[PDB]
């Protein structure tokens, strides 16, 4: 959103002149072309995106309740890896405390 420079307030959009005219309750107008041509946004596969599990995938190697498999880590050569299965497509991600991640994630 556009924050009014005088009073820290959100300003309406009110497309009138063929472009965006940001109007505030204090009367200030900013014009403001280019950067704010995006009016509406909606991501339809939320709950399965990368940033949904980013913290969990980062913390997965240190979680003692996560499944481990007898697979060698290509980075630090530990004999085991943490195995994750996220999403409705059952994406398998192998992670290690050294920071290795199985390509995806």
């Amino acid at each position: 959103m556009k924050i009014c420079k005088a009073c820290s307030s959100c300003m309406v959009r009110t497309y009138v002149d063929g472009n965006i005219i940001f109007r505030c309750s204090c009367g200030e107008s900013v014009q403001g072309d280019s950067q704010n041509l995006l009016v509406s946004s909606k991501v339809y596969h939320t709950g399965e995106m990368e940033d949904k599990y980013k913290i969990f995938i980062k913390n997965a190697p240190f979680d003692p309740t996560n499944c481990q498999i007898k697979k060698d880590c290509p980075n630090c050569h530990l004999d085991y890896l943490t195995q994750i299965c996220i999403g409705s497509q059952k994406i398998i991600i192998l992670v290690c405390r050294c920071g290795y991640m199985s390509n995806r994630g």
Partner: protein, 149 residues
């Protein structure tokens, strides 16, 4: 609209617009109020965009009960309006306004009530108003996180 209803011994069953709670404690800037929910107003992200659209829409939604103080940027007027809408004994809304001491008494009573029944686990004095606002923003952030699935 994102409405916050506080049910306590002092008062209950009153849905206040969320930004009015932040405004009553001195946080009147919309950017600072929204920053309490998104934690960063200048981060592109994906949750931040969705949350910012919801909060911007919720700020401008017209409320039937809090209509006069919706666009008020002075916290004293919002505190007075809440005091009038909350206090049981204020059955005459105009007589007391002439007396300045009456207005001060209502404001002090409302501020004490708010410090006692708004997130009392985070503090019950006037030193923790901003911390309470941070916690409330965190709660709204979690709710909006659940909202986007």
């Amino acid at each position: 609209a994102i409405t916050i209803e506080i049910n306590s011994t002092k008062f209950s069953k009153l849905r206040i617009p969320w930004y009015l709670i932040f405004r009553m404690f001195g946080m009147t800037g919309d950017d600072s109020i929204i920053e309490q929910v998104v934690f960063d107003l200048e981060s592109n992200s994906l949750v931040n965009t969705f949350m910012i659209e919801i909060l911007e829409k919720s700020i401008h939604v017209l409320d039937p009960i809090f209509q006069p103080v919706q666009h008020e940027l002075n916290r004293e007027k919002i505190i007075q309006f809440l005091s009038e809408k909350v206090s049981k004994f204020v059955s005459n809304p105009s007589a007391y306004k002439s007396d300045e001491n009456a207005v001060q008494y209502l404001n002090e009573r409302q501020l004490t009530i708010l410090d006692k029944i708004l997130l009392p686990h985070m503090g019950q004095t006037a030193d923790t108003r901003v911390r309470k606002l941070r916690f409330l923003g965190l709660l709204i952030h979690k709710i909006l996180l659940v909202i986007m699935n």
